[PDB]
Design a protein around this ligand. Structure first.
Ligand SMILES: *[C@@H]1O[C@H](CO)[C@@H](O[C@@H]2O[C@H](CO)[C@@H](O[C@@H]3O[C@H](CO)[C@@H](O[C@@H]4O[C@H](CO)[C@@H](O)[C@H](O)[C@H]4NC(C)=O)[C@H](O)[C@H]3NC(C)=O)[C@H](O)[C@H]2NC(C)=O)[C@H](O)[C@H]1NC(C)=O
Ligand SMILES: *[C@@H]1O[C@H](CO)[C@@H](O[C@@H]2O[C@H](CO)[C@@H](O[C@@H]3O[C@H](CO)[C@@H](O)[C@H](O)[C@H]3NC(C)=O)[C@H](O)[C@H]2NC(C)=O)[C@H](O)[C@H]1NC(C)=O
Ligand SMILES: *[C@@H]1O[C@H](CO)[C@@H](O[C@@H]2O[C@H](CO)[C@@H](O)[C@H](O)[C@H]2NC(C)=O)[C@H](O)[C@H]1NC(C)=O
Ligand SMILES: [Ca+2]
Lengths: 49, 41, 60, 49, 386, 23
């Protein structure tokens, strides 16, 4: 079954490259939903229980 | 939620009325053509 | 210059360094522990993150 | 490996039929779920589903 | 006068690691800004420890110091301290002199440490709001259709209540709602003086609304336009605004706006509350044709900031007035945040007059830098009436 | 008796900056 394993690994690598192109550096977030940059997302903010 | 709607729904109601009219006079033709045994019919 | 520096991970010992940017390295889930400190704005691998600064001994 | 691809391309018609029946099943159950739980997953919890 | 002429001479910068600003942060026991340790001797008049050598700065807990906006404001608001001392030396009985900045930070003299969680914001204080704009005739429209049920309904209820906290006794307000039918939420049926008692009735009635029905913007806006044209009761005869709290939709209602305000005598402010996938294009359109603004409140943390930014728009005609708008105003009797008893506060807005020699930019000069203010205690007035 | 001052509807006002034109 090494051949099937190798083919699956190749397909996984190709899909990983496609995903890197799609979502590179886009999956970042801030605890405060009102700030959309690293510089803005600094300091403290008020949350409600 | 809670009985809200818009214009597209207001149109889809009438389109569904038309669809109901079509699948009625097409079941009538087959009903009064061969007198409901097959599962699909 | 002397923003907390290191190359390894366990002892957290200083090193020679330059440049006005110094950073912190930590796991995203384990936020309240800095794994590695140095200078520049390097790219983490997994599951680490980088938070860079502008002045000496900003990373703390 | 190439024999597998040849067989896949030979049976692609039945493959498409089988994949279309599954899509029809998913569409039917999606419509039923939209009818049953449409606009109802709106409770007073702070987090949105 | 000194705040206006110093801001013009300010050169906007982008780094502060080399040039650290020196200031005393009131809420304390950091690279980019150096802090001071004052002497804090005890003094009369005030009931706390004060320092006559510099002016303290209060930054709200949700506003990050060290930002480019805050650090630049902390630089040009350092020449005020040499004017603070000259006023105190000329009038030894001078109480708190403060500068409420539009950024959010308040700089007051003399320096004293700040008074659970701190929720103080200078831009929401009655003395700041009364000097940032003229009296208004607010009329809140609340979308109580079915689509707002759930989380976005309790955000609307909180936002409306938080908006009513920005109205003084000179402003007249009323709250309405619409779902295929427009009606008042309370027993008032017309604009009321919006004092403490009247606002509590509206706050009680807003919390008791249920979301159910079909949205209809034409009937909701016709009701609002017909309530701002009463002229049968006591009103403010000033700024006439409509605040629409909704989620989204596809109706623009251009025929209502083309019929009720063809000359655009009424500003329309629109709010989009909650997280949803409804269209916001019509919502933003009503805020641009009518001389208003569009605001977004996605969570409970954005309620406080977005419900006080409409005063920036309302202050545009005040800035263009010139020196005619520089009239000293005195607020109602209230209790000082830094415990000092019952006080009344003077008020004078500050304009951004950079590039006034050429008069060419006029891009951010339509807003006010902030509000000036000096406190007068009631014990001072009681001493003049033996 | 309300205030005698009133500042609104200035012709020179820009009002071209809403919250939707940018986004
Ligand atoms: C009083 O009014 C004057 C003008 O009438 C105002 O001074 C102006 O301040 C702005 C900063 O807010 C300067 O803008 C310069 O140019 C751009 C535009 O912001 C900036 O570059 C980026 O801008 C984005 C905004 O989209 C920002 O997020 C980013 O951080 C900026 N920097 C980057 C990407 O590196 C410049 O940084 C900024 N500064 C420069 C070029 O030095 C205007 O140039 C200023 N106008 C004048 C005539 O000086 C002043 O702030 C007002 N008073 C107060 C208290 O706000
Ligand atoms: C905004 O940030 C800075 C923080 O202090 C201030 O910039 C400093 O202003 C000083 C006074 O203008 C300068 O000192 C003198 O500057 C004049 C220039 O005309 C020269 O004589 C000399 O450079 C200097 N005189 C001396 C040393 O005897 C500082 O040099 C200057 N600092 C920098 C880094 O430029 C601004 O004043 C401040 N703005 C306000 C309103 O306070
Ligand atoms: C006060 O409100 C009324 C009702 O909205 C306005 O209209 C008048 O209504 C009364 C009672 O029906 C009648 O006098 C007339 O039918 C209406 N017109 C006039 C000129 O009175 C009324 O205009 C408003 N203002 C005043 C000063 O009454
Ligand atoms: Ca609706």
């Amino acid at each position: 079954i090494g051949n099937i394993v190798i083919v699956t690994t190749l397909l996984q690598f190709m899909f990983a490259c496609i995903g890197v192109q799609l979502f590179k550096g886009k999956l970042y977030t801030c605890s405060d939903s009102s700030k959309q940059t690293e510089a803005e997302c600094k300091g403290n903010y008020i949350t409600y229980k | 939620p809670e009985d809200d709607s818009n214009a597209t729904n207001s149109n889809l109601e009438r389109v569904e009325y038309l669809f109901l009219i079509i699948f009625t006079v097409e079941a009538f033709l087959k009903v009064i053509a061969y007198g409901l045994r097959n599962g699909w019919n | 210059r002397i923003c907390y520096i290191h190359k390894a991970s366990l002892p957290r010992a200083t090193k020679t360094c330059v440049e006005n940017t110094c950073y912190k390295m930590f796991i995203r889930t384990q936020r309240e522990y800095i794994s590695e400190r140095g200078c520049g704005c390097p790219t983490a691998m997994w599951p680490y993150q980088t938070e860079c600064c502008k002045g000496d001994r900003c990373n703390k | 490996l190439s024999n597998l691809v040849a067989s896949l391309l030979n049976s692609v018609r039945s493959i498409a039929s089988l994949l279309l029946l599954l899509f029809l099943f998913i569409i039917i159950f999606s419509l039923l779920g939209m009818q049953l739980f449409g606009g109802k997953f709106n409770f007073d919890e702070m987090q949105t589903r | 006068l000194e705040a206006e002429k110093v801001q013009a001479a300010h050169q906007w910068r982008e780094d502060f690691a080399s040039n650290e600003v020196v200031y005393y942060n009131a809420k304390d026991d950091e690279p980019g800004s150096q802090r001071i340790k004052p002497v804090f001797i005890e003094d009369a008049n005030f009931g706390r420890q004060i320092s006559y050598q510099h002016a303290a700065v209060h930054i709200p807990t949700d506003i990050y110091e060290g930002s480019t906006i805050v650090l630049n404001e902390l630089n040009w608001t350092s020449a005020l301290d040499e004017v603070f001392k000259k006023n105190r030396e000329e009038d030894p009985s001078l109480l708190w002199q403060v500068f409420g900045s539009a950024t959010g930070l308040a700089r007051y003299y003399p320096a004293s440490p700040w008074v659970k969680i701190d929720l103080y914001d200078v831009r929401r204080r009655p003395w700041y709001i009364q000097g940032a704009a003229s009296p208004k005739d607010m009329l809140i429209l609340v979308d109580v259709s079915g689509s707002v049920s759930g989380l976005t309904l309790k955000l609307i209820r909180t936002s409306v209540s938080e908006m009513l906290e920005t109205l003084s006794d000179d402003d007249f307000v009323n709250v309405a709602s619409f779902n295929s039918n427009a009606q008042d939420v309370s027993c008032f049926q017309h604009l009321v003086q919006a004092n403490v008692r009247n606002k509590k009735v509206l706050k009680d009635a807003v919390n008791n609304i249920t979301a159910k029905g079909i949205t209809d913007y034409k009937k909701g806006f016709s009701f609002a336009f017909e309530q701002l044209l009463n002229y049968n009761v006591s009103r403010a005869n000033c700024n006439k605004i409509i605040m629409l709290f909704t989620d989204g939709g596809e109706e623009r209602a251009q025929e209502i706006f083309n019929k009720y305000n063809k000359d655009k005598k009424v500003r329309v402010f629109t709010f989009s509350v909650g997280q949803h996938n409804y269209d916001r294009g019509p919502i933003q359109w009503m805020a641009c044709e009518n001389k208003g603004y569009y605001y977004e409140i996605p969570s409970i943390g954005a309620i406080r900031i977005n419900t006080q930014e409409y005063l920036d728009v309302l202050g545009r005609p005040m800035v263009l007035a010139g020196d005619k708008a520089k009239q000293v105003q005195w607020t109602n009797v209230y209790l000082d945040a830094l415990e000092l008893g019952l006080v009344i506060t003077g008020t004078l807005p500050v304009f951004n007059i950079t590039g006034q020699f050429e008069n060419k930019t006029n891009l951010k000069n339509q807003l006010i830098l902030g509000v000036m203010g000096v406190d007068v205690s009631l014990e001072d007035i009681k001493r003049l009436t033996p | 008796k309300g205030p005698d001052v009133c500042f609104d509807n200035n012709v020179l006002e820009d009002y071209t900056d809403c919250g939707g034109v940018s986004g």
